[PDB]
Amino acid sequence: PQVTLWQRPLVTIKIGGQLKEALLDTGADDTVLEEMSLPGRWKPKMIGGIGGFIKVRQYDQILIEIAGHKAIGTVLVGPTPVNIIGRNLLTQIGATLNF
Amino acid sequence: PQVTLWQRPLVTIKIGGQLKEALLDTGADDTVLEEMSLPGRWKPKMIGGIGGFIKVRQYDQILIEIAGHKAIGTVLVGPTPVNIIGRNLLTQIGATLNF
Ligand SMILES: COc1ccc(S(=O)(=O)N(CC(C)C)C[C@@H](O)[C@H](Cc2ccccc2)NC(=O)O[C@H]2[C@H]3CO[C@H]4OC[C@@H]2[C@H]4C3)cc1
């Protein structure tokens, strides 16, 4: 689908058996989700945004469905104020920007 | 132009007579630029991102050229780590997202 930007580009995602809403975010290199339960082993990592930094947990090779499209990749979990789908997953579902 | 997302979607902007690079950011409601000199009166405002909050200066009806396209709108200036073009300006240049 094509989406204009008069509203936030929110989509439905499915990850770890659960349904959530997330923001398609061309401004984000990586994917960052609010606190949630994931299966498996993770790695401690710190990332930075507009107001400073947060500690996240890094999960690799995680299956995630984004607006119907399946992708496997790294997902960071930590105290972000919103679920963000970043470029590491956007390239996998073939998202482009038109200006 | 259409742009894929294997790299950051950076474009050239011109604002207040100066040339800068900025990120086309569908995840940002508003436009936030690093500290720079602008002409005119502004308003004190605070905005929030992944690691917390920052104080910005809000400039209205500012002329800004984004990748060749002229737009007039609100620009926030403050200690963001990167120049961000948000949805308030992206709609004006007709940017869309395709997934
Ligand atoms: C390497 O991996 C990553 C992944 C993500 C991030 S990030 O989240 O910091 N970011 C990067 C951006 C260059 C600042 C993406 C934006 O799209 C955020 C995403 C985000 C949205 C909402 C809340 C928190 C984060 N936009 C936002 O800060 O905008 C505010 C300010 C700009 O306009 C408005 O829209 C959202 C708020 C608000 C004021 C950093 C590193």
Author numbering:
A (entry chain A), B (entry chain A): 1 to 99
According to the publication:
We have been focusing on the design and synthesis of non-peptidyl PIs that are active against HIV-1 variants highly resistant to the currently approved PIs. In the present work, we designed, synthesized, and identified two novel PIs, GRL-09510 and -09610, which contain a unique polycyclic crown-THF (Crwn-THF) as the P2 moiety and a sulfonamide isostere. GRL-09510, which contains a newly-generated polycyclic non-peptide P2-crown-tetrahydrofuranylurethane (Crwn-THF) and a sulfonamide isostere, potently suppressed the replication of wild-type HIV-1 and HIV-2 with favorable EC50 values.
The structural analysis using the X-ray crystallographic data of PR complexed with GRL-09510 showed that the P2-Crwn-THF of GRL-09510 forms a strong hydrogen-bond network with the backbone atoms of Asp 29 and Asp 30. In addition, as illustrated in Fig. 3c, the Crwn-THF forms greater VdW and hydrophobic contacts with multiple amino acids in the active site of PR than the bis-THF moiety of DRV. The two strong CH–O bonds between the Crwn-THF and the backbone carbonyl oxygen atom of G48 with the interatomic distances of 2.4 Å and 2.6 Å should also be responsible for the observed potent activity of GRL-09510 against HIV-1WT and various drug-resistant HIV-1 variants. The Cβ, Cγ and Cδ atoms of Ile47 (located in the highly flexible flap domain of the protease) are engaged in multiple Van der Waals interactions with the P2-Crwn-THF moiety of GRL-09510. The P2-mono-THF (of APV) or P2-bis-THF (of DRV) due to smaller size compared to P2-Crwn-THF may not retain their contacts with Val47 generated by the I47V substitution. Thus, the P2-Crwn-THF moiety of GRL-09510 perhaps not only contributes to the enthalpic component of binding via H-bonds with Asp29 and Asp30 (as seen with DRV) but also contributes to the entropic component via Van der Waals interactions with Ile47 as well as Val47 (I47V) due to its increased size. Thr91 is located in the helical domain of the protease, adjacent to Trp6′, and is engaged in multiple polar contacts with Asn88, Arg87 (directly) and Asp29 (indirectly). The T91A substitution may induce structural distortion in the helix generating a conformational “ripple effect” that may destabilize the H-bonds between P2-Crwn-THF moiety of GRL-09510 and the backbone of Asp29.
